[model samples]
Target: QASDVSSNISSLTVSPTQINDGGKTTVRFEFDEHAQNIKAGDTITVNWQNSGTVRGTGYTKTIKLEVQGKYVGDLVVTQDKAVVTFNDSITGLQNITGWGEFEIEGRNFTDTTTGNTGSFQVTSGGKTAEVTVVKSAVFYYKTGDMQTDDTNHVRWFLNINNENAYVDSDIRIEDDIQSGQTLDIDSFDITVNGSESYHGQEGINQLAQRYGATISADPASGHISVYIPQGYASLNRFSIMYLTKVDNPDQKTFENNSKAWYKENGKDAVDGKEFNHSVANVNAAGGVDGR
Candidate 1:
C-alpha cells in the first residue's frame, strides 16, 4: 500500500468536471517530490486519447511549459482554461464523443496521478458518440386519455441526433411489462425514420431482422421485444412507438421498463439506455389516483 501510495501522484484535479462537447477546462497536476528547476529545453505535453472531433483531421494536443526561473514548492501546473482554437486540419462529426487521456514526460517529474510516464485516461468527449440513443416516455390509457384500469399503455420515444451515423444488427431495444400485461401487436407503429416502402410486419421485422433482430412477445411473462433492425441506421435516429396493454385490467399501479441497445463505438453493442414509466390506478370514481 505504501508503494502504491509512493508511486501515485500527490494531486491531479480538473477545476470543472464537466465541459461542453469541444470545450476547454483547467487541469491541475502536482508531483509530491521536492521541486527542482526545469532544466534547459525541458517541456510538458498532454496526448489525448482520441484524435477527437476537432477542426480538421485533428492533431496531437500538447502544452509546453516555460516556467521562468526555478521554484521550491510543489511543481504544480494548471492547464489554462483558455479559448481553444480550431484549424482547417480538424474535421470531426458533431457527436465525435470520447473521454480524455494523456502521457506526460520531460521533467524527472512524472504525473503523480499516472505514477509514471505512461498513459492515463479521463472522461469527457470531443463531441459525442453518434450511436447515442435518447429515450423518454409517459403513461396513458390505450382507449381513453387520463383514463386507467381500461386498456392501459406506456408510450416511448427514441431518437438519434442529426449527426451522421449508423448502427449494426447488434442493436436491440426491449420493453418488459409489469405482471399481467400484454403487448398490443397491432399497436406497434413506425412513427419516424420510416419509409413508405416498408409497412406492416414486412417493414418492422425486415429492417431490424436484416441485422439479426427480431420482435418477440411472451404472454407468459409480459416481456415484449421491440428490436431495432440491423442497427436501424439513420440521421434523425427516428422513433419507433407502440402500446402494451393488460388483460382483465388490474386496479394496481402500473410500471414498465423500456431499454434500447447500440454499439457505442464500432465494437460491442451495449444498452442504449432505459426509459421507465409508471401510472397510478384510476379511483373508483374514474378519476386518476396517486401512486
Candidate 2:
C-alpha cells in the first residue's frame, strides 16, 4: 500500500470532489505516482468512462472498481488499492445529475491513456413549508332592522396557503376576539387572486390589497392584528375577511377563535381553529352571509 501521488494527480484521483446520494458518498481513489513505477509482476490496465445525466428505475449500476484475482474485462486491481462503486438506479434529477471518468493505460507506459474527472451532486434535502390555515363558520343576520331577531350579525373566512417552491415569511394575523365579539373594522378584508376578483368584481377589503399590509387592533383585549411584510410566494391563494358584532349579547354562543402566524427560513409557524355562532339548541347545518 503506497500513497504518494500528488503531482496534483495526473493519472487518477476521485474522492468526494462532490457527491450526494444514498451511497453516503465516501468514494476514495488513488493512482499515479507514475503508478509506483509498475513492475511488481507488471499489470495495470484500468479503464472507466461515464457521462452526464444519471438516471434509474431500480438498477443500472452507478460505478465500481476493485479487481485483484485478475480479470481485465470489468476491472479490479490491487497493488495499491482501487475500489470505487457508485451503483445508481434510484433517482430524482438523477440525484443532481451525474458524472465520472477514470482511465489509465498499462504496460511499460509510454502513454496510452490517462484521465480523471468527477462531478455528481445528488443532494435533495432541507424543506418545510406547506402553510395552511382555514377557518370559516359563523353567520347570523339582522344588522339594522330587517325584522330584527337580534342575531347582531357576524362574519368569517380565512384560508391561507403557500404550497412549496419558496417564499413565505412574516405573515401574522391574530383574531381571538371573543368577549361578545366586536371587530368589524369596517368589514376588513384581505384578498389575492380570489374573493370574487376583489369583493365580487371591481370591489374591496385588504391583505394590504396588493401587498404592503398592516392592520392592528386591540380594542380592550379583542386582539386583532394583521401584518404582512412582503412574505408569500410561489403558488399562493389567500382569503381573509373580517367583521363582527354582538359585542355583548350576554354570551349564549359566539365563539370565534383565530391565530395564524407564519415564517419559514427563520422557522415558527402557527395555526388555530374554531368559529361558532349558536342559539342554544342548534340545527343550521351551514349558512353564511345569507343568515
Candidate 3:
C-alpha cells in the first residue's frame, strides 16, 4: 500500500561538528552544499535520497527519529544516493548541555509485521552524539516500561540490511551497548564510557532519557522506542498480526489406478454394488496425481 521507504546509517561522515547526548544543541547543518552558519536551536532541511544499493534507509522506517533525548526530524540512508532528508533543530546552548534533552521522535506508526524495525542517529560532522547514552545499558524487546510478557517486541540498529550499505550512516547510545535483542539492534555498536556526573547521574553508557518514547532504524522496519513521562502501562499490548489463508495451487491426480475403482466400494459391498466411478482414475480423497 505504501511506497515502502526505509533507511539505515552504515557510515555517517561530517566536518567540524559538536553534539552531546541528553543535552541541548545549538548547531546548524545547512544543505544547498553550503553549511549554514548559525548558532544552536536553529532548524533546516536536507533534500536527500538513497541510491546505489540503497536498501533505502530514511524517514520511511517505521516512521521516527529520536536523538539526544528529544524528537528531531526524519532521516534516510542509501548507497549511491547522495542522501536526502531534513535537519535536526540545533540546540541554543554552548555548554555540553546545549543539545537540550538529548532525545528525539519521528514517523509515528503502528504495525504487526513480525520483523520490521529500524535504527537512527545524528551527527555534527560525522559521529554519534558527543554525550553519553545513559540508557544504553537498559533496552528491551518491547517498549521501555516493558514490564510485561510480550515476545513480539523489537529493538533497533541490527545488521538486517547487510551493513546497511544502502546508506553509510549509523547512530547509537554514545557507548558500546550490551543489548541482545532482535536484528534491529544487532549493531548498536556505538556506546559511551564516562561518569554520570555531567549527565544528571543517569548512569554509565545509557541510552539517555528525556528523548521522548521512540527512535527508528533503517529498512523501514516500523519499530519504535518508548520514552514517555507517564510510562507504557496503558500502551497497546505488543500483539503481532499473523497472515492467514492461502490459495491452493492448480494440480491433478496420477494414473487411473485400481484405487479409482475403490471410490464406489464404500457405497456397495460385494456383487450388488458393482464397482463404478464417474471420474476414472481419481481417488475418493481427491489425491493429487495419486500415488
Candidate 4:
C-alpha cells in the first residue's frame, strides 16, 4: 500500500535554523530502510508556512536525491511548497539496508518581526515530518521631534532585541550625527527590560557595571557607541533615547544614521545592520517650519 511508503519516512530537518530575515537555510528529509521499496514515479512534497519565501532555482544542483545511490532530481517550487518526483526505479531492494534522503535549498525568508517561528513539513504518501526555524533579533531606530523648550535639541530613539530573541554575543550600537549636529552626551537615557532605567553620565557608568557594557560619546563628532555583553542583552529589550544639538542656526535639517553590530546564531563574526532617520525644515524655534 502507499501508506507503507509513508511509514518509511524518518525525519525532516532544517540547517541553520535561526537566521536574520531574508536569510537562507537548507531542508533535508530522511527515510528508513523500508524506503528501498519506493519506486520511480513516487513523489515527495514539502510545505512551508509563515517562514518567508523561496525562489525556484539556483544553489548546488537545485535538489539532491539519495535512493539506492546518490542522484540529482528535478525540483518544482511554488509560492509555499516544493515537490520532487523519483525519476529512476530502485534495484536490488533487498540488498539496500540503510537510509535514503532528499535535500532542498530553502531561501529568501523575509520576516522582520523577531522571535517568530517558521516551519517546514515533508510528506510522502501518508506520513510526514516537520521542523521549525526561528527569526533572529532585529534592531529598530527612529528620530523623534525637536524639543519645544530647546529648538536646537532633537530626540532619537533605538530599540534593541525588539522581539526578545536569545542572543549569545555582545551588541554594539553606533549612532552617527550629521556633520552640522553635535550629540548632547548628558542627554542620554536608557531603559532595560521595561523596568530598569538609567540617565546621564553617572547612570551610564552604573549601566556599564550592571551589564558588563561599555558606553562612550563624542559630543563634538556627534558619535555615540554602546556595547552590551551577552547575558545582559539576550531576551532583554533595551530602549535608548538621546538628544543631538544643531551646531549652527543655519542648519535647518537634521539627519543621522545608526548601525547595530552583533553576531547571528552559529556565526563567528559580527554583522552590522543600519537604519537612517531625518527631519527637515526646522526653524530656530525647534519646530518644523511650514513651507
Candidate 5:
C-alpha cells in the first residue's frame, strides 16, 4: 500500500549555490530511516519549478540508487522533474544513517532572480516538501565588427553582468589579441550601467584616471589586464569597447580571446570563467588582387 513518506525527507540542498545563465547545478535529496523501508514499486516524484531543465535519459541514466550494498532503484528524469521508482522492497536499506540520497542535475537556467529564491517540490503519497534553487550569477558575451572596406580595422565589444546579478567584489578582465592583430591603445573605452565612464583617447591612462582601475599590458605578448575595484564593478553592467588593427590583412582570420575573473561571496577570487562569446573571429575578405 502507498504510504505518505514526505516526512521521511531529512533535507534538500543545491550545490554551487550560484550559476551562470546556462550553467549546471546539482540538487541533492536526503531521506531519513523511515524512507529506507519504502515498499517495492513505490514512487517519489521531484517537481522542479522556476528553475532550469532537468537533465534526462543520456544524462540521468548514469544516476543509480545504491544502499545497503544493493541497487535500490532507478532515477528517471524528465524535462521538469525526476522520479525514484523503487524496484524492490528496501526494508533494511539503512546500512548507514540517512543513507537514502539522490542527486539530479539542472542546466540552461535563465532565472532572472539574483537571489536563491527559486524553488522545487518533492512529493510522495500525497505529501510534499519544497526546496530552494541556486542563485543566478552574472554572465557576459563578446562580439566583433569588421570594416568592410578596411578589414584590418575591427571593433571589439564585450558586455558583462548584463543580468545585473548581485556582486560585492572586484572584477578583473583579461583580453589577448592574436599574434596577427594589434590593439589600438587609443580606442580603449568603457561604459558602466549605461553611462560612459571613460572615453578619452589616451587608452590605459584614461581608464586609470576615470575609475582608478589597475591596468597592465605586455607589448610583446599583446595581453591586457584591467582590474576594476569593487566600488565601480560591484553589481553593475559593464561594456568594454575597443579597436584592433589586423597586422596582416592577408591573414585568413583574426581572433581575440577575453575572460573575466571575480571573487565569490566571502571567497578568494575565482579563476577566469570562459564564456561562449569570449572568442571572436573576423574573416578576411578578398579584393581585386584576389589576395
Candidate 6:
C-alpha cells in the first residue's frame, strides 16, 4: 500500500516561463515540474524547446539547465495589488498594474508578486553572473490606519484638505502610501502648501528641490523596485526631504539607505570635496535615532 502512494503521483506543477529576452516574440520554456527526491548536489539537466512538432516562421529559444547544488530562495507567488488605482481613480488607493517587465540591475526581470528580495541571480555550472537590481520604488495602499506618524507619508494627512469634507467612514489618507508611487517622492507639491518646510520645519527633503528618486507606475508587482538613471540616488538632496526622513511616529527612515536611492551626476561637491558622493543632507531633518 505504501508503494502505491509513491507511484500514483497526482498533478505535475510546471515552473513559470523563465525568459531572458530580445523581445516578446521569443519562445521560452519551463520545467514540467521538478522531480521528486532531487535535492541539493543532485544534477538534473534540462532542455528548453518549442512544443510544436513542425518548424514554423515564429521565433524560439532552447536553454540547457543543470540544477546545481545550491537552493535558490523560494519564489512565492501572489496577485497584482493595483486595481484600486484603476477602480477608484480617486488617487487615494493602491491602483497600478504591470503588464510588462521593467528594467533594474541592467536587466529586465519579470514582475511577480512573489519576487525575492534583491537576492536572486542566474548561474550556470558554478559560474556566477551579474547582480543587477538597483533601487526601484513601489507604493503601498492601506485603507486602515495603524501607525500614521511618519513624515515620509505625511501627504496622507492632506488627502482631503477640506476639513469639513464629506465623511463616508473613518478613512485616513495617511492610512498608507497610495499605489503606483513607490519610486521616490510620493507626491510633492510646492503650491499645495507653501514649501517653506515640510510642516514649517527647515530641514526635510530639501523643501522643494527635485532630488533624484525612483519612479514607478506598476502595481502588479510584489517588492516594487527602484532605479537611478545616472546611478547613486539620494533622498536628502531633494526639496521636501523631510517627507522622506524617519522621526517620531515615523520609523522606516531613509537615512543609512540614502545611498541606495539615487544616481549621481558628476556634479562637483561644493563646501569641501572631502567626501565625494558621501555628502551632507541639503535639508536639516535632524533624526534622533538615540543610537
lDDT score, candidate 3, position 12? 32
Spell out the clash pairs found in candidate 2: 62-87, 62-88, 63-87, 66-76, 67-76, 67-77, 95-122, 189-206, 190-206, 190-207
Candidate 2 structure quality by residue, lDDT tens digits, 56-90: 11111222321332211122322222222212221
Q: 29-137, model 4: which lDDT tens digit per residue? A: 5454455354556555555553435221212223344433445234444435555555563433343322222223333354565565655554444455444445465
User: Please, what are the lDDT tens digits per residue for candidate 6 over residues 112-187?
Assistant: 4453223223222222223322223211111111121222332222211112222222211111232322323443
Alpha-carbon lDDT, every model: 0.35, 0.35, 0.21, 0.58, 0.55, 0.21
What ranges in model 5 sit over 4 Å off? Answer: 1-138, 200-203, 264-269, 275-291
Off by over 4 Å in 3: 1-63, 77-291
Best by the lDDT measure: 4
- Give me candidate 4's TM-score against the actual structure: 0.47
Candidate 5, residue 210: lDDT: 70
lDDT of 3 by residue, 156-253 (tens): 22111111112111112111112222223332332212111211123212434432322233323323222222222122121111111111211221
Estimate TM-scores for all models: 0.36, 0.19, 0.17, 0.47, 0.44, 0.17
lDDT, candidate 1, 190-226, per-residue tens? 5443543334466667545554545666756767665
Candidate 6 structure, TM-score to reference = 0.17
Query: Tell me, what's the RMSD of every candidate?
Result: 22.8, 27.7, 28.8, 21.6, 19.0, 23.3
Residues forming the 10-long window of minimal summed lDDT in candidate 5:
282-291
lDDT of 4: 0.58
Clashes of each: 14, 10, 98, 0, 0, 35
Q: Identify the runs in model 6 with alpha carbons over 4 angstroms from their true place.
A: 1-29, 32-73, 76-104, 107-121, 124-202, 205-291
- TM-score comparison, 1 vs 5, better candidate: 5
